[PDB]
Design an enzyme around this catalytic site. Structure first.
Site: not given
Lengths: 165, 165, 167, 167, 166, 167, 167, 166, 167, 167
Positions: A45-49
Site C-alpha cells: 500500500f506504500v507509494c512506489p515514489t
C-alpha cells in the site's frame, strides 16, 4: 565489518526487463557501473515514489553508462504483474530482479530475518565490483534519486581523478 | 546482519563544543533525535564541505529537536585546534566527539582497520535509540545535508503517523 | 617477559618531516642507532618541553649517528598542523610518526587501552635492532634529554668495547 | 599493556635488612612511597655502583618518606653473605629482597627468561600502589640515583598539587 | 609417569669447579657415569653434611669413573662465594652447577614451585643417559653417601653382568 | 611434578597378611607411619633379598610405630602362594597388597605402562599422609633396609623437632 | 557392537608352555585354528575343572589342527609356579599367556575394569583370524570342553562346506 | 566392555505365544530366570534344529522356573505364520518375540548392522536381571540345548550356594 | 528438504519374484520407469487391497514400460511364504523387496522409527532416477491404483513433451 | 523419519481471505480438520486448475467441517493482487497464507532450497494436529480434488471407527 569498499559477491537471479524475462549474474556487472536498489515487497500500500523517481532519471543514468537493478524477495513472475498492474511501475525500463532464495539480499547483509523481506537499501558499484556508496533507510523514509545521481557523478570523478583538493 | 532498526550501544567519549570540553554518553541521546556524523580525520587536504553544510542547517535541526554529533578517531584536543585553525570548521556549534579508542566507531561497524580511521557514515537515531537511517560513502563522495534534512523530517513523520498511505 | 634486549618488531607508518610526508619502516632503522620517543597526544595543554628539549640536542644526536622518531596515536596530518601552530614544535627537525592503528605503539607494549593513547616512553635501539635502554614516566613527570644523551654514549661505548666494563 | 599507571600486584618475599631476615608483602608498601630496584645477580664481577649510589641517597629518601627495595633472583640467604663480603654492599641499610620463584620479578615484567635473572629496572610506586615511573637499562648502562631522586620529587609534587604546570 | 629408566633431557648450565667457571651440557655426561646431586639453596643455616659426605667419597667415585654434579637454583657466582666462605664446602672438588632458570631442575621433575628452589634429590645416570637410581627426601632428612656408593657399584655390576639370575 | 611433600591419594585394595586376607585403605594409614614398598612381580627368578631384608627389620619398625605395605600388580591370591612357596617370603609378617587394577601403583606414579608391572620404588609416609622420602631403583639394584630405617628415624626426629639448626 | 564375525586384533604377549617361556603374537595364529581361553586369576580357591577339562581334549584338538591359548592377567612367571604347584594344571601342555598390561584381554572386550581381572570367556578363531564362536559365563558356572569341541568341528565343517542346506 | 554380569535394559516388544499375541517387557522377567534365544530370520532354508531342541527341553525348563524368549528381527505376525507353516516350529510352546525396531537386539549388542538381522546368540538372565551366561555363534554352528540346560542348573546352584569353594 | 525432484539413493536388497529370489539395485532401475510401493508388514489382519490393485494394473504398467517394486521391512524369505499363503498376494508377479536393514526405507524417508516398519508410501521414479510423484497415507486410508496410473501417464507426457500446458 | 502421523509444528503467518488480511496460527487449526495446500508461486504462467478445483469443492469441505489453507512463499500482498487479477483465483473463498520466511514450508519439509519456493504438496491434518495423508507431485503433474475428498472422508471414517477396518 562494513560492506563499504568491498567487492560484490557472485550471484544468479532471474529478472523482468521491459516485458522479457532474463538472467543476471555478477558477470553482467563487470566493466559497468551498477546500482542495486533493494526494497521490501511488491503490491504494498506504500507509494512506489522511490522506484518511479529512479525511472525518471534512468535515461540520464544510461548516458553515464550506469545499469540499475531493482531487487526484492518476490518472484520475477510477480514483477511482471506489478509492472502491468501499476501505473508508476510501468515507467521503469530497467531490470527487476527476483530473489525468493534471499541469496542476493544476504550478500549485501540486507535481510529482515523475521519478515523474510529486504530492507530499503541502495548500493553503488564500480566496474571493478567494489562498493563505493551505501544508503539504508527504515520504512516511510524515502531515498532521493537526484541525491543518488550526484553520488554517482562524484564516484566517477574520483575514479577519473585520484587525490583532488 | 544490518545495523538498521537496532538500538545504539552505550559509550563514553570526550568532545569539543563551542569552545568548551564536555563528555557525551548514550544517556544524553535518550529522549532526543540524534545524528552521528562520522568522518576519517582532521587537518586533511580534502575540503570539509560536508561538515560546513551541516553547520548551515544546524539552526534548522535544533528547531526540530535534533542533536548533531561529529565523530572522528582524532582527539578532542585536535578538534579544538581545527576549529580555531580552519574557517569552515569555525562555523560548527555542535559537539565534535573524539574517539582515539575507536570504541564508538566500532559500535557502528565503521572502522578502516588498516588505516585506523572511521569511514564516511551518517546515522539517524530516534529518541528510543533505534537507528532509522544510514548513509555510507567512499572518499571523494560527499553526502548532502539537505538530503539528510529530508530523511529526518520523514523519520519524525513516520514516528508521529504509523501506517500512512 | 622484559622488552629490553629484544629485536624491534617490523612496522609501516606514515610520518611528517621538514614540511613533507614520508613512510618509515624497520628497514630505515637497521644499520643505524634509533630513538623512539612516545608521547600521548597532539595539541594537549601540557607543554612539549620534553619534545623541544630533544630538538635542541638533535644536532648532537645526528653527529653521534643517531636518528630520532617521535611517535603518537594521532595522524601525520595533525603532526604537520601542530608543527606550524606551536613554536616549540617548529624546532623539530626529525620525523614525527603517526600511529592511528596503534600497531607501532603495541609493538613496544606502550598503549593506554582505556584512553587509546601512547604512554610517555623512550626507547634506544642499536643498528642490530636490539633495545638497549627503556624509560617510561607518568603524566607530569619530565624526561631529561641530557640523561638520554648519557645513556646513548654509554650504549655506544659498550657496543665498541664489549665485555670491557668495570675494572 | 604498559605497567605505567597501574597498581602493583601482591607478593610475599623473604628479605635481609640490617643483619636480620624479614618478610615483606604488598601490605608493607601501603600508604608509603616505594622504590623497587631490580638487578640481575649477586657476587658478579660488575661493579655495584648502582647499589652504592642509592645507599648514599637512602638517608635523603627516608626524609621524603620513601622506602627502597633491592630485588634479585638470588636467595635472601645469599644477600646476607654478600653484605658481609663486599664493602660497597655493606653500606646498604634498606631491605634486600630475594626472589628465587621469580614471582615478584614477573609481576613487573622484568625477567630474563633464558637467563633466569632479573633485568636492571627501577620502579617508583606511590602510597596508592600505582606505578608512576619506570627505568630499564641493559648490562653496562648505569642508572644514576640523582635523576631517580628528581623523578620522585616530581611525582610527589604532582600527587600533592594536581593541575600543573606549563601551558 | 615415573622418571626411572628414562634418558636424561638435554641442558646448558654454567658451573663452578676448582676456582674456575665452566659450562656443562648433556654432551659431557655421554660415555660416563653421572651423579646429579640436587639441593635447595646456598648459605642456609642447615648443616651441609650431605655435600661434605660426597666430597669425602669423591676420590672413590672418580676411580669408578663417576662424575658428580651438585645442582641448585642459585647462580654459579654464589657457588664460588660459598666455596670460599664455608670450610665444609671448601672440600668440594666436583662441579657446582647453577640453575637460575630452573630448566635442569625441571628436567628431573624436582622443583618446589611455590618456593622456587630444588628439592633434595639424588640421581644416578649411566653412560647411555638412562636414569638407574632415584632418591628424594624432605628437609631435615639426611642422604647417605655410603649407601649411594653401594647403589652405584650395584648399577655398574648389572650393566656389566646382565641377566645374572640371583 | 614431584610427589615429595604431598598427601597420598585414597585407595581400597585387598591384601594378604600373616595367613589371612584383609582389605587395606587410606583410612588405615591415618595416624601412623606407613612404608609403601613397590616391586614388579611375584615368582620371578630374581632373588627377593629386598623383601627379606625388610622382614628382618619389621620387628624393629613395629616398635617405632611403622607399618609396612608390600605392593605389586599380582593378585593377593598369588601373594599367599608365594608366601608358602619361597622360604625368604615366609619371613614376611606385614601386609602384601595386590594391585591387579594398578590404581594404587598409579597413585604413586610408579607403573611400567608397556610392561604392566610396578617399578622398584619405596615411599615413606607420615601420620598426616604426607610423603617424606622416595627411593626408586632399576632392575638388579638393591634397596638397603638399614638405610631405609635410618631415613625413618630422621623423619620422626624432624616431625617431633621442627627447625633444628646445628651449631 | 558384537565381536562375532570379526578379525582378531594384533598382540605381543609372553607365555609359559611346557616348561619354557615363549612369545606369542597374532602372526602365530595365522593359518591355524585358535582357541583363546580367558579366566580371571591363578592360585584361586575355585577348582580349575575348566582348564583341566581342556587339557584332556588337547591331544584331540592338536589332531584337528587347533591351538589353545589360556589367557589371564597374571604374569607368565606366575603360570610357571601354578603349573608346578597344582596337579590339575600340571596336565596342561598348551601355552599359558600372561597379560599384566591387559591389552590382549581388552582386545576381546573381556576385562573386569573395577577388579582388574579377565572375565570367563572362550573364543574360537579360524585360520583367517575371524571369530566364529563366543562363550562367556559368570563365576561358578562351568564351561564344557566337550561342547566346545563340538562347536569347533561344526566351524571346520562350515568353512569346508559353505552353504549346506538340509533336505 | 563386556555384557556379562550386567543388568538387562528395559524393553517393550510384541510376541506370539500359543496362538495368541502378547506384550512382554522387562517387568515380566522380574523374579524369574529368563532365556533370550536370538536367531536371525524366519522362513530360512537353514535347519531349525536349534529352536526344536529348546522346544523339547521346554518342559524341563518350566520345572526349573525358567522362561524362554525366542527373539528375531521379523514381526510377530510372521512368527504366527511360521508356527502354522513348519512342523518343527509347531513344537514351540514359549513366546516368540518380534523385534522390527531392533531395540531388544541392540540392548544385547547382537545386531548384524549391514544385514539388519540378529546374530544367533543365547543369554541366561537371573531373577535380579543380571546376565549370568552368554553364547554366540556364526551361521551353520549349532547351539546345544542340553549344554544350555547344564549351564542354567550351574547358575541356579551358585545363586543358591554362594562361596562354596570347590 | 523435499524428496520430490531428487535422484534416488543407491541400494542393494534381496527380493522375491515369480517363485525365485533375486538381487535388485539402483542399477536395475536405470533407463526405466520405476514405482516403489512401500507397506508396513506381511501377514497383517488388514486387507491387502492396495497390493491387489497394483497386481491387476501390472500388465498395463508393463506396457507403459514401468517396473513395480513392493517394499517392506520383512525379509524376502517372508515374502515367499506370504505369496504361497494368501490368494491376493498370489496375484503378485512383480518383485517383492525385503528391507530388514531399513536402508532402502530410510533412503525415501519413510520409516516408523518407533515401530520399525515402513509407512504406506508410493513413489514414481523416471529413467534418470529423479522422483516425480509421492503419495503417503495413514493406516486405513487406501491408495487407489487408477490415480497412480494417471499420474504416471502425466509424468511420461511431461518428460516426452516439455513446455505444457494450460496458460 | 516420515512426516506422517506427527503433530504439526507451531507457526504464525499472515494471510488473505475474502478481501481482508488475517493472522493464522496453529491455534486456529486445533479442534478442526485442516488441509494445507502448498504451491510454488503466484502469477506463474502454468494454470491454477489445482487451486480452482479445490475452490469448487470448498462448499462441500466446509460442510464436512474442513478448513483449507493455501500456502506459498510469496507475500499476502501478492495473494490479494492475484485474487483480483485472475478469474480462477477469484473463486477462492478460503485463506491464502504468505510465507516469505519459508518457516511454515520448512515445517512440512517441502522447500526447494535452490529455487526458494514450495513444492506441490497437500497435507491432511485432524483436529488433534496429527497428519493423516500426504501427496507431493512434480511440476506439471496435477493433483485431483475428488481424490482428496475421498481421502478426507476415509480419514474421518477411521477417526470415528478406530481399529474397525477390513473385515
Amino acid at each position: 565489518m562494513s560492506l563499504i569498499n568491498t567487492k560484490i559477491k557472485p550471484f544468479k537471479n532471474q529478472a523482468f526487463k521491459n516485458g522479457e524475462f532474463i538472467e543476471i549474474t555478477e558477470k553482467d556487472t563487470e566493466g559497468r557501473w551498477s546500482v542495486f536498489f533493494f526494497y521490501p515487497a511488491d503490491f504494498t500500500f506504500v507509494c512506489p515514489t522511490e522506484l518511479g523517481d529512479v525511472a525518471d532519471h534512468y535515461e540520464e543514468l544510461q548516458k553515464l553508462g550506469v545499469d540499475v537493478y531493482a531487487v526484492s524477495t518476490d518472484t520475477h513472475f510477480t514483477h511482471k504483474a506489478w509492472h502491468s498492474s501499476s501505473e508508476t511501475i510501468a515507467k521503469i525500463k530497467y531490470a527487476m530482479i527476483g530473489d525468493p532464495t534471499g541469496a542476493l539480499t544476504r550478500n549485501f547483509d540486507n535481510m529482515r530475518e523475521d519478515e523474510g523481506l529486504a530492507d530499503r537499501a541502495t548500493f553503488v558499484v564500480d566496474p571493478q565490483g567494489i562498493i563505493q556508496a551505501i544508503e539504508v533507510t527504515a520504512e516511510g523514509i524515502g531515498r532521493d534519486a537526484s541525491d543518488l545521481l550526484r553520488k554517482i557523478k562524484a564516484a566517477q570523478y574520483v575514479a577519473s581523478h585520484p587525490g583532488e583538493v
